[PDB]
Write an enzyme that holds these catalytic residues in place. Structure first.
Site: not given
Ligand SMILES: [Cl-]
Ligand code: NA
Length: 129
Positions: A35, A46, A48, A50, A52, A59
């Site tokens: 990750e 991301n 949309d 958002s 991380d 998120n």
């Protein structure tokens, strides 16, 4: 901070992640590696809108507040910036909430595609824990 394999393993074990909700330590170290490559400062945007954050790429759409994700929740009640600290306490505490959400560690895409079903114990091998 960029964690060493065994260094992170030891840190997570101390924070209660080993076997948390049935997930062996190896699972958590594997997820962290893919990750964020063990980097607490890792951030990724991301589609949309958002973002991380941190070692476990939490998120902002549902777990932390970064002030730029419209209609988001912040279930962990914490600024997303706190997940970028050298101290993983905040990340661990929030990850315990996430893994208890119902879908387990499947919430982490990298874990599902690169850790699930593999010999995750290999990630803590040779570690003095
Ligand atoms: Cl679960
Ligand atoms: Na949020």
């Amino acid at each position: 901070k960029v964690f060493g394999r065994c260094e992170l393993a030891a840190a997570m074990k101390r924070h209660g992640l080993d076997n948390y909700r049935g997930y062996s330590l190896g699972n958590w170290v594997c997820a962290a590696k893919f990750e964020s490559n063990f980097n607490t400062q890792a951030t990724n945007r991301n589609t949309d809108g958002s973002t991380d954050y941190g070692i476990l790429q939490i998120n902002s759409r549902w777990w932390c507040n970064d002030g730029r994700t419209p209609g988001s929740r912040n279930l962990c009640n914490i600024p997303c910036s706190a997940l970028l600290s050298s101290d993983i306490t905040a990340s661990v505490n929030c990850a315990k909430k996430i893994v208890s959400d119902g879908n387990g560690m499947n919430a982490w895409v990298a874990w599902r595609n690169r850790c699930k079903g593999t010999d995750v114990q290999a990630w803590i091998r040779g570690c003095r824990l």
